Amino acid sequence: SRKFFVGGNWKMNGRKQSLGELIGTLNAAKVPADTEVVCAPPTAYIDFARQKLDPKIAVAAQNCYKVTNGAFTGEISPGMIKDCGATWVVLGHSERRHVFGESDELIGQKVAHALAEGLGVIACIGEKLDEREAGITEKVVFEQTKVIADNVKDWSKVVLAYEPVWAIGTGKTATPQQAQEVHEKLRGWLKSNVSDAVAQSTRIIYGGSVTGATCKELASQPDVDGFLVGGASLKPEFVDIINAKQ
Amino acid sequence: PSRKFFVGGNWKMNGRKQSLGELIGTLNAAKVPADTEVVCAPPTAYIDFARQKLDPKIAVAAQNCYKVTNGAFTGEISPGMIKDCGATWVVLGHSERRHVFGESDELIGQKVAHALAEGLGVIACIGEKLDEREAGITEKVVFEQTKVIADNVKDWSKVVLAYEPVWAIGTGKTATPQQAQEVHEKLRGWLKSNVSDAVAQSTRIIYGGSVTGATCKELASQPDVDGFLVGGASLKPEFVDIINAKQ
Ligand SMILES: [Br-]
Ligand SMILES: [Br-]
Ligand SMILES: [K+]
Ligand SMILES: [K+]
Ligand code: NA
């Protein structure tokens, strides 16, 4: 009975005028009560976004650091995120891992601290192309999930996001069947390494290519519980993804 | 054409709306001298907040930015966003970015060029590590860092150079007035030879690394020290005394 979860990752896009407009559109849309919607604005606009967005939509930070305060020029802490009214943080996003070199160890530390501070965490995992081509999809993704799991006590405020990095900007297409396949292996890992209740209740959302015209078939997959949306989250079509299970 | 005394407050990853609100209230009430250019750099989540609360006389800076205007860079912000929030400066190349988060010289240079193109001022940070100082190659290191910056600066009017020896940052071990003056002298001489005398004479070179209300006066008295980048003490009432260092 897992509640459909749709996250919108705006990445490094937008300004007050365009984002205010995007927010206006989301506020005007009807969001199904059985759908949990979260938007992740650029870090300069967390406060702005929370002020303008309907309380029904939650706000997420796109990243955070692993202690509450300190000499870390350019970083923000979970405490600041909560202070701005945001209730989630995205951690371990492929861009942080593969453009900014964030290690699993660091990601684990961030998860532990964010959860301790009272945030929910959208914890991202995923294998690159070379990893998949070498047949170590499972090794890579189970290892990433284990690091996350080793830093989670209460799974109620965690959502796992599978990013098929091998099929993001590579020329490869991930089929719904390939997505379902990994999601099923991930849920199996939870069942096997945590508990049946956790496996059954934890949302595992898809972070690959999703558009208004692809989301239905993906959402239909039994182990896909929603989406972490990239580019489409900036467009009115995001509303259609929110309404995938309608 | 005298160089205006410049005092930057880098709040780093500290503060919440309540405490930063109180910090800001104190600054607003202090009446900073028109003779001092004051800039505060809040955590990224509070740039908008700080600008809304701070008296217009005080400028706001971001603590970092990325090198393109928009894109698939989860967790980053661009100069355009910074300007949109009403901030007019960005701190680039801070020791913590370089040494905790591994930002390369090349990346910092790309950030400098983009920030300047987008209409921001840049506080460009350089500085040597302890091993480098105990060995005596301070000069080679900071010249190299400065050249990367300079290679990406065509107009110096909105650039401030911040010399922060890494061993002075957060350690309590403030460089002596002599140590700072000696480095600042050389950096100004570098600007003279490699850019122009006009840029050398007009560009603020500020010192940072354990600047406090007790050490600011004597550091400030050095002819080639044009102000400060203040970390820890920018979170304290002391910051007003530093702003008033020349008063
Ligand atoms: Br605090
Ligand atoms: Br500093
Ligand atoms: K499903
Ligand atoms: K001076
Ligand atoms: Na692709």
- Active-site annotation holds for A183: no
Dmax (CA) for chain B in angstroms is: 48
**How far apart (Å, rounded) are the C-alpha atoms in residues B47 and B87?**
7
| Residue of A13, A71, A93 with shortest CB distance to B170 | A71
Nearest-CA neighbor of B16 among A77, A53, A73, A74? A77
CATH architecture for segment(s) A1-246: Alpha-Beta Barrel (3.20)
- The residue behind tokens 């929110």 is A242
- One DSSP character per residue, A59-95 reads EEES---SSSSBS-TT---HHHHHHTT--EEEES-HH
Question: What count of CB pairs under 8 Å joins A to B?
Answer: 129
Nearest-CA neighbor of B206 among B66, B1, B10? B10
Residue tagged active-site, from B94, B96, B114, B128: B94
Q: Name the DSSP letter for residue B232.
A: G
Beta strands in B52-169 (DSSP E): 59-62, 89-92, 121-126, 159-163
- One DSSP character per residue, A109-129 reads HHHHHHHHTT-EEEEEE---H
- Determination technique for this entry: X-ray
Q: Measured at the alpha carbon of residue B85, what is the angle toward residues B83 and B87, in degrees to the nearest 5?
A: 55
| Residue of A40, A81, A99 with shortest CB distance to B45 | A81
Residue tagged active-site, from A36, A113, A163, A183: A163
The burial class, CB within 10 Å (0-12 / 13-18 / 19+), for B147 is middle
**How far apart (Å, rounded) are the C-alpha atoms in residues B233 and B212?**
6
Nearest-CA neighbor of A175 among A136, A212, A133, A220? A220
Secondary structure class of B41 (helix, strand, coil): strand
**How far apart (Å, rounded) are the C-alpha atoms in residues B128 and B143?**
10
Residue B214, CA distances (Å) to A246, B167, B177, B232 in order: 66, 19, 12, 13
Tokens (6 digits) for A49: 């976004």
Q: Where are the domains of chain A?
A: 1-246
Residues A14, B70: C-beta atoms closer than 8 Å: yes
Nearest-CA neighbor of B47 among A42, A26, A39? A42
- The residue behind tokens 């900007």 is A169
- B222, B226, B231, B237: CA torsion to nearest 10: 80
Nearest-CA neighbor of A59 among A67, A72, A50, A70? A50
- The residue behind tokens 């070199």 is A101
- Residue B194 backbone dihedrals phi, psi, to 5 degrees: -100, -25
The burial class, CB within 10 Å (0-12 / 13-18 / 19+), for B113 is middle
**How far apart (Å, rounded) are the C-alpha atoms in residues B47 and B31?**
21
Tokens (6 digits) for B160: 């401030």
Q: What is the resolution of this structure in A?
A: 1.6
Q: Name the DSSP letter for residue B88.
A: -
- Per the DSSP assignment, residues forming a β-bridge with B25 are none
CATH architecture for segment(s) B1-247: Alpha-Beta Barrel (3.20)
Handedness of CA B221, B227, B228, B234 (dihedral sign): positive
**How far apart (Å, rounded) are the C-alpha atoms in residues A95 and A74?**
17
